[PDB]
Structure formats: C-alpha cells, structure tokens
Design an enzyme around this catalytic site. Structure first.
Site, PDB file in Angstrom:
ATOM      1  N   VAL A  26       1.007  -0.894   0.369  1.00  0.00           N
ATOM      2  CA  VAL A  26       0.574   0.158   0.406  1.00  0.00           C
ATOM      3  C   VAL A  26       0.596   1.501  -0.276  1.00  0.00           C
ATOM      4  CG1 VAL A  26      -1.294   1.528   2.107  1.00  0.00           C
ATOM      5  CG2 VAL A  26      -2.466  -0.017   0.538  1.00  0.00           C
ATOM      6  N   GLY A  27       0.030   2.343  -0.170  1.00  0.00           N
ATOM      7  CA  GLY A  27       0.985   3.712  -0.369  1.00  0.00           C
ATOM      8  C   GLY A  27       2.231   3.769  -1.640  1.00  0.00           C
ATOM      9  N   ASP A 164       3.280  11.815  10.199  1.00  0.00           N
ATOM     10  CA  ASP A 164       4.076  11.734   9.552  1.00  0.00           C
ATOM     11  C   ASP A 164       5.491  12.835  11.219  1.00  0.00           C
ATOM     12  OD1 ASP A 164       7.000  13.131   8.677  1.00  0.00           O
ATOM     13  OD2 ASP A 164       6.415  14.508   7.775  1.00  0.00           O
TER      14      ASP A 164
HETATM   15 CL1  LIG Z   1       2.765   9.299  10.627  1.00  0.00          CL
HETATM   16  C1  LIG Z   1       3.757   8.090  10.804  1.00  0.00           C
HETATM   17  N1  LIG Z   1       5.047   9.123  11.316  1.00  0.00           N
HETATM   18  C2  LIG Z   1       6.244   8.097  11.223  1.00  0.00           C
HETATM   19  N2  LIG Z   1       6.016   6.569  11.412  1.00  0.00           N
HETATM   20  C3  LIG Z   1       5.100   5.708  10.793  1.00  0.00           C
HETATM   21  C4  LIG Z   1       4.852   4.794  10.592  1.00  0.00           C
HETATM   22  C5  LIG Z   1       3.546   4.655  10.438  1.00  0.00           C
HETATM   23  S1  LIG Z   1       2.356   6.750  10.224  1.00  0.00           S
HETATM   24  C6  LIG Z   1       3.662   6.836  10.809  1.00  0.00           C
HETATM   25 MG   LIG Z   2       7.603  15.302   5.946  1.00  0.00          MG
END
Ligand SMILES: Clc1ncnc2ccsc12
Ligand SMILES: [Mg+2]
Ligand SMILES: [Cl-]
Ligand SMILES: [Cl-]
Ligand SMILES: [Cl-]
Ligand SMILES: [Cl-]
Ligand SMILES: [Cl-]
Length: 348
Positions: A26-27, A164
C-alpha cells in the site's frame, strides 16, 4: 511471545505475528515500506511498516529510536497513534528488524480539497480538528515542521488525524523548485532567518485553511525567492522590529534590497468568505512568529463557536526529549530501541 510466520512481499521477507492476515503492499513509500493487513485481535484494517536498515549508521539508529519514542507518546483522537510494535528477534543479540503497526488511512486532505465542494461548516470542522491535535502536540514541546494536505488523513465522516513523526529531515533537493513540500513552510524556516519554534506550525495551518476556502494553493512558489515574493505581497515587507530578529546578516541584507509593500486587505483576497474566517487568517499569517495566534488561543476564536468545548481539548503527558542532545554509539541506540519495543503496552 506470539507465533510468527514468514512470506516474501515483493522481494522482501516479512515475519509477523499470526494475528496479522491478508498482507498486501500500500502507499507511494512516503512513510516507508508499508503493507495493509487485517488485525484479527482488534478487527481493524491496519498499516504494517517494516523499517529499512534501521541500525546502518549512528544517524539511522538515532532516527529509528526517535520515531519509536514519538509514536509511543502520541495518544489523541486527532493524531496518529501506535497500535503495536514487534520484532521476531528472541534476544538483543539477534535484533535487526523493527515493525510498526498503525490504523490504515484511506484518503488524505488533498483528495477532498481537489474533488469535493466544501461548506464553511466543513472548513470550520477540519481546521478545528487540526488545531485540537496541535494544542496537544505543542503541550509536549513537539514541533511537527511538515503540516501539509498529504499529512492529514480524513474519513467519510470528515474526521481528521495528523501524520509524519520522526522520519528523515527533508533534504534541500526535496525542497527545490515547484514543489508542495515547500509551499506550506513558514518563511523563517524556508530561508533559515533565525532559531525557529512551534509557531512555524500555525503558519502552515493558515496556508491549509486558505486553500480549503479558495480551492487554490496560497503560495505556489516556483523556487524559494519566488515564494518569498508571493508571501511579502500578501502580508507586507518586514518592519525594523522583525529585521532585528533575523540573526543572519546576509538574509537581512537581501530583505532590505526589496521595495517596501503594505499588508493587503484579506477581505478583497478571500472574496465572499465568512468574515470570522478572514479574521482568523489575519491572526495566523503574521510574518513575525512572536505575534502569531497560538493553537490554544485559536480554539477559543468565534469561528469555531459551534465545535469549541474547553473540557474536551486535552493536553499531553510530559515528553522527555533529552536523548536529542546525547552522543551514543550504534549499539547503544540499538539497545535503547530494543527496550522500547519489549516495554510496549497496547491501547485499551
Ligand atoms: Cl505518520 C507516521 N510517522 C512515522 N512513522 C509512521 C509509520 C506509520 S504512519 C507513520
Ligand atoms: Mg515530512
Ligand atoms: Cl498472534
Ligand atoms: Cl490512531
Ligand atoms: Cl530481527
Ligand atoms: Cl501536500
Ligand atoms: Cl517521556
């Protein structure tokens, strides 16, 4: 310890607990190497991230530790949380791989801004949710630094979460030219004017709110200097008080080379918008970061009167970030990370 099973996912070997079934990629790789699965313990569709080369250098080992600490801390309705973290390793001596589990996000704000007609009521509820999550994030002395539509997950009921945390610092190349990665950045961080702080995130919320109201990017610069010219035409050139605060002499000299311009009338820019929306945008999009509205102050603004509940806007537990100034070896960062994996307690 659960039982693990192995499978090859597009030239990668995944080893995961039996509870996770029907794994499929995914993504666009924006948050790492991520698969969709069904979690049989909770009944949720989840995202499983397998980290690439988590301990390959001091820089990478420290980034792994940072991402796991941030995700374990965040417990709020409007922020991504951690559902699980696991390793197939049975000891520190065989520890190599880390896997992170979150709720599977379907759509982001870009899809709804691009393809939907939004009422002033939709804009009130979306921006209320971003500020509610930011009040929580800022209470822990955490700066997001990258708020933009692609980092905001939105569902069918207009419910929103912020994404993030603890990924690699954005490179100068990723910030070059006609790119969405720079259009939401506060001018003091885009041009390295001064030591920045949490006020950078409120500039970003202003840029997002303007785009939900107009359907157009507020400051779509072709490069850093084009984008600064778009910003100063709207908010005006700096006065002597802000110029004193630009620590960089060469950045001060460049600003003084530009002809002076007054702040524009935001009612003539945001034609037909709710006057209360116009008023809030004037308090977010202030060039001097010391003078911008805070998230806690913005929640009490009359634009949000239908949603604001001061007994349901919670703050965060204290967050110890002293590790950020610590100098350790690769194996010391790896041991700290292993302890945080084995100590994880899942949500209720
Ligand atoms: Cl948003 C976010 N920031 C860092 N790691 C992850 C792993 C899945 S979502 C995510
Ligand atoms: Mg960023
Ligand atoms: Cl299991
Ligand atoms: Cl969540
Ligand atoms: Cl492992
Ligand atoms: Cl974006
Ligand atoms: Cl802590």
């Amino acid at each position: 310890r659960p039982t693990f099973y192995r499978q090859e996912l597009n030239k990668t070997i995944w080893e995961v607990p039996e509870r996770y079934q029907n794994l499929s990629p995914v993504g666009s790789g924006a948050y790492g190497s991520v698969c969709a699965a069904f979690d049989t313990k909770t009944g949720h569709r989840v995202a499983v991230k397998k980290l690439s080369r988590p301990f390959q250098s001091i820089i990478h080992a420290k980034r792994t530790y940072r991402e796991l600490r941030l995700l374990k801390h965040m417990k709020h309705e409007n922020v991504i949380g951690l559902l699980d973290v696991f390793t197939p390793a049975r000891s520190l001596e065989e520890f190599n791989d880390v896997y992170l589990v979150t709720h599977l996000m379907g759509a982001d704000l870009n899809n709804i801004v691009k393809c939907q007609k939004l009422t002033d009521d939709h804009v009130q509820f979306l921006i209320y949710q971003i500020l509610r999550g930011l009040k929580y994030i800022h209470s822990a002395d955490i700066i997001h630094r990258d708020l933009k539509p692609s980092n905001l997950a939105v569902n069918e009921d207009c419910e929103l979460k912020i994404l993030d945390f603890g990924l690699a610092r954005h490179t100068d190349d990723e910030m070059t030219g006609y790119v969405a990665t720079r259009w939401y950045r506060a001018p003091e961080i885009m041009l390295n004017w001064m030591h920045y702080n949490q006020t950078v995130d409120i500039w970003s919320v202003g840029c997002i709110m303007a785009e939900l109201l107009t359907g157009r990017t507020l400051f779509p610069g072709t490069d850093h200097i084009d984008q600064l010219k778009l910003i100063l035409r709207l908010v005006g050139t700096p006065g002597a008080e802000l110029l004193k605060k630009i620590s960089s002499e060469s950045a001060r000299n460049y600003i003084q080379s530009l002809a002076q311009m007054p702040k524009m009338n935001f009612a003539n820019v945001f034609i037909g918008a709710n006057p209360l929306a116009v008023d809030l945008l004037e308090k977010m999009l202030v060039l001097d970061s010391d003078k911008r509205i805070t998230a806690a102050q913005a929640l009490a603004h009359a634009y949000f009167a239908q949603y604001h509940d001061p007994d349901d806007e919670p703050v965060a537990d204290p967050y110890d970030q002293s590790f950020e100034s610590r100098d350790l070896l690769i194996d010391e960062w790896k041991s700290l990370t292993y302890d945080e994996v084995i100590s994880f307690v899942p949500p209720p």
